Write an enzyme that holds these catalytic residues in place. Structure first.
Site, PDB file in Angstrom:
ATOM      1  N   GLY A  19       0.900  -1.161   0.051  1.00  0.00           N
ATOM      2  CA  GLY A  19       0.187  -0.110   0.035  1.00  0.00           C
ATOM      3  C   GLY A  19       0.806   1.255   0.002  1.00  0.00           C
ATOM      4  O   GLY A  19       0.509   2.412  -0.602  1.00  0.00           O
ATOM      5  N   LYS A 202      -0.613 -17.849  -5.900  1.00  0.00           N
ATOM      6  CA  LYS A 202       0.793 -17.588  -5.898  1.00  0.00           C
ATOM      7  C   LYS A 202       1.591 -17.924  -4.635  1.00  0.00           C
ATOM      8  O   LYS A 202       2.590 -18.361  -4.613  1.00  0.00           O
ATOM      9  CB  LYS A 202       1.456 -16.373  -6.225  1.00  0.00           C
ATOM     10  CG  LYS A 202       1.096 -15.275  -5.708  1.00  0.00           C
ATOM     11  CD  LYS A 202       1.226 -13.751  -6.204  1.00  0.00           C
ATOM     12  CE  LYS A 202       1.272 -12.635  -5.082  1.00  0.00           C
ATOM     13  NZ  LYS A 202       2.140 -11.616  -5.513  1.00  0.00           N
ATOM     14  N   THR A 259       7.335 -14.362  -7.387  1.00  0.00           N
ATOM     15  CA  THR A 259       7.015 -14.576  -6.061  1.00  0.00           C
ATOM     16  C   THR A 259       7.480 -15.798  -5.814  1.00  0.00           C
ATOM     17  O   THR A 259       8.152 -15.994  -4.852  1.00  0.00           O
ATOM     18  CB  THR A 259       5.449 -14.841  -5.969  1.00  0.00           C
ATOM     19  OG1 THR A 259       4.790 -13.313  -6.047  1.00  0.00           O
ATOM     20  CG2 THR A 259       4.922 -15.042  -4.401  1.00  0.00           C
ATOM     21  N   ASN A 267       6.853 -17.018   2.699  1.00  0.00           N
ATOM     22  CA  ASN A 267       6.346 -18.026   2.243  1.00  0.00           C
ATOM     23  C   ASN A 267       7.585 -19.198   1.797  1.00  0.00           C
ATOM     24  O   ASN A 267       7.393 -20.346   2.216  1.00  0.00           O
ATOM     25  CB  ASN A 267       5.633 -17.797   0.706  1.00  0.00           C
ATOM     26  CG  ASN A 267       4.316 -17.283   1.012  1.00  0.00           C
ATOM     27  OD1 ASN A 267       3.598 -17.405   1.881  1.00  0.00           O
ATOM     28  ND2 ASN A 267       4.143 -16.232   0.039  1.00  0.00           N
ATOM     29  N   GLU A 289       1.681 -15.771   3.986  1.00  0.00           N
ATOM     30  CA  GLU A 289       0.441 -15.610   3.487  1.00  0.00           C
ATOM     31  C   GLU A 289      -0.122 -16.982   2.974  1.00  0.00           C
ATOM     32  O   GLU A 289      -1.434 -17.244   2.825  1.00  0.00           O
ATOM     33  CB  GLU A 289       0.289 -14.706   2.264  1.00  0.00           C
ATOM     34  CG  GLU A 289       0.398 -13.098   2.760  1.00  0.00           C
ATOM     35  CD  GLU A 289      -0.889 -12.742   3.573  1.00  0.00           C
ATOM     36  OE1 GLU A 289      -0.655 -11.838   4.392  1.00  0.00           O
ATOM     37  OE2 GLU A 289      -1.860 -13.322   3.404  1.00  0.00           O
TER      38      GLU A 289
END
Ligand SMILES: CCCCCCCCCCCCCCCC(=O)O
Ligand SMILES: CCCCCCCCCCCCCCCC(=O)O
Ligand SMILES: Clc1nc(Br)nc2nc[nH]c12
Ligand SMILES: Clc1nc(Br)nc2nc[nH]c12
Lengths: 346, 346
Positions: A19, A202, A259, A267, A289
């Site tokens: 953000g 992803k 990613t 991750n 995530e």
């Protein structure tokens, strides 16, 4: 038109790294940019330090970026609204604080750009779908692409797609988000569903990429995981009614490949530890995530009867203590097959 | 059938890193593996050292791999023939030394697996096309995928596609090349053209990836280059009459993403130096595949009227002393556009 649009004000709801980076992009296209962050004390610190020391350390905010905890002050006058609020807090935010915001957005027909990624546990819906329960879907677009936050925040060349069912909406957002120095370039597409699916899946696949590294596998394996994993994004997108045109573009393949190659991401480290034999309990110290996403993803897949081999096995490794080498062997027990891609040209 | 095929003998014409790695794969599926290498003196050294010290240093050859300079001894009795001879030497090899080999292949209907990649300068044809001037096309298949040689040679998990116009040919080769421990897994496809196009174009695009790094760009940029670059492989494949089903698979996207991320590869270092302002003359010390390929690729593209923006600009940087920042600006002067991918689902 290939001519950029400049605005007086933009608001970004969500103060994470992404953000914040997007607020840096907007600071070059809008005179004023407000970033909403719920904790007033932290708002003060950030504005003082002129740096999001919380989630984007090392980056100096443009002087025209102001953090605030006042939702009303945040959106008032904004001509574009970005959501980057975590999936799990999205619904509550609108219910508890969105009444006037929603009225304003509807009244002034303000474009809304969804940047949040994930799957809500209770409904199995994606972020733009949830937001669409509160804001008119004609106003909604999705931003997705290979976009590491530090690179975006510092103006290092980045391409992303903006998706909207009505291509004309996406094209207009393309003019607002694309920068005058061509460091942030947006491409229009209709495939909102493909973008949201890719953006969630992803993260699960990235854990698998970690697992592969922890198992002693190399870059050939990572490439195979990306390519086979992509078909799972494709199939789930189809089942959800998406047109799929984003799957092989920036939001799909582009973001997935990036990613899955981020070796320092949470991750990846979680997958690597799992691959090295560590149980998830010991690992869990800050949720990756992919961990959070794997469960609702499997439930949605099951609900839609979509087979997602890699994602399923990753879920097993993460949630059901399945040995990574057993998962791999199961995955490779399907026998020899064709690649599973249709011809493009007849 | 998902049941593997084992053979008595395999021959690999071409002694590079890739040919040598593939001979390591075959050593686990065939009792005898011959690798043809033109220089007898070097043949002796390699057999003595039990290691291809020339092109695959650090890897101990299986005891059942023998190097030889005798073409006739090389193929006699072979039940699969691999070509990995450099594009530029392919034609001459058949003309000068292939007479009996060709007769043998035709007589015994021996499967031929094309692993050579590139474009012949005189005819603008791809390796399997050239070989198909000498061997019956029904016997021809192509192997392509994300397959770093060291990883393949050492048995680190690798997936590749095998392409043949007749899927049944590819499926049979799949049974021969796939290993009993599932470390080398082959996927069947019909898209020979897509494989050859991707395998050549990836080298040109890798130089661009290098350029991006030399320009101070990051991983977001590399992901964008991969994704936009992929459309160029797609469009050229279409114009060449290919079905395109390999484009978004292992041979296309898979191999492209791997190759463009190999920072120590010669293609990448050449691009990086170019990106840093060094002229090609100073760089040229061992030709990067992308350099050699860029020219015939542009000529073929022009001949077929296919626009390949990234490849064209890379050719300019490499052959026409174009400043990399000017090339980038030209590339980004096309204005805002849609992503250019059709929907998969209607
Ligand atoms: C959670 C397991 C992760 C292990 C990752 C393995 C490395 C890449 C594997 C890619 C091979 C794809 C297997 C496809 C088999 C199938 O379609 O059922
Ligand atoms: C030889 C130039 C290499 C520079 C590489 C730039 C980094 C990736 C650029 C990707 C943006 C793609 C531009 C597409 C524009 C077009 O379709 O004409
Ligand atoms: Cl309760 C809550 N709401 C929003 Br909006 N964002 C948050 N971030 C942490 N907790 C949060
Ligand atoms: Cl002339 C020639 N032929 C073949 Br086949 N391979 C080679 N490698 C270098 N020079 C070569």
């Amino acid at each position: 038109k290939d001519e950029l649009l400049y605005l007086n004000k933009a608001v970004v709801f969500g103060s994470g790294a992404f953000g914040t980076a997007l607020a840096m992009v907007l600071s070059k296209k809008c005179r004023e940019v407000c970033v909403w962050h719920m904790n007033e004390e932290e708002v003060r610190l950030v504005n003082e330090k002129r740096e999001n020391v919380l989630f984007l350390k090392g980056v100096q905010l443009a002087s025209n970026i102001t953090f605030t905890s006042d939702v009303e002050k945040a959106y008032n006058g904004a001509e574009i609204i970005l959501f980057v609020i975590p999936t799990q807090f999205l619904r509550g935010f609108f219910e508890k604080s969105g009444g006037n915001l929603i009225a304003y957005a509807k009244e002034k027909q303000v474009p809304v750009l969804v940047c949040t990624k994930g799957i809500e546990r209770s409904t199995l819906k994606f972020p733009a779908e949830i937001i669409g329960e509160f804001l008119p879907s004609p106003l909604l677009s999705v931003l997705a692409g290979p976009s590491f936050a530090i690179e975006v925040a510092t103006g290092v060349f980045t391409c992303v797609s903006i998706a909207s069912a009505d291509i004309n909406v996406a094209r207009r957002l393309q003019r607002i988000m694309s920068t005058g120095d061509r460091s942030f370039v947006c491409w229009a597409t209709t495939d909102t569903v493909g973008c949201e699916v890719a953006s969630a899946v992803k993260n699960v696949l990235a854990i698998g990429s970690g697992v592969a590294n922890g198992l002693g596998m190399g870059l050939n394996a990572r490439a195979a995981l990306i390519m086979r994993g992509l078909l799972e994004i494709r199939d789930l997108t189809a089942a959800l009614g998406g047109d799929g045109s984003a799957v092989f573009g920036l939001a799909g393949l582009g973001d997935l490949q990036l990613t899955c190659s981020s070796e320092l991401s949470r991750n990846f480290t979680v997958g690597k530890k799992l691959g090295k034999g560590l149980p998830i309990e010991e690992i869990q110290r800050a949720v990756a995530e992919g961990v959070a996403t794997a469960d609702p993803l499997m439930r949605l897949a099951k609900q839609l009867k979509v087979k997602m081999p890699l994602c399923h096995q990753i879920y097993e490794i993460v949630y059901k203590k399945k040995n990574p080498r057993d998962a791999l062997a199961d995955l490779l027990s399907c026998g020899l097959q064709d690649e599973g891609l249709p011809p493009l040209f007849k």
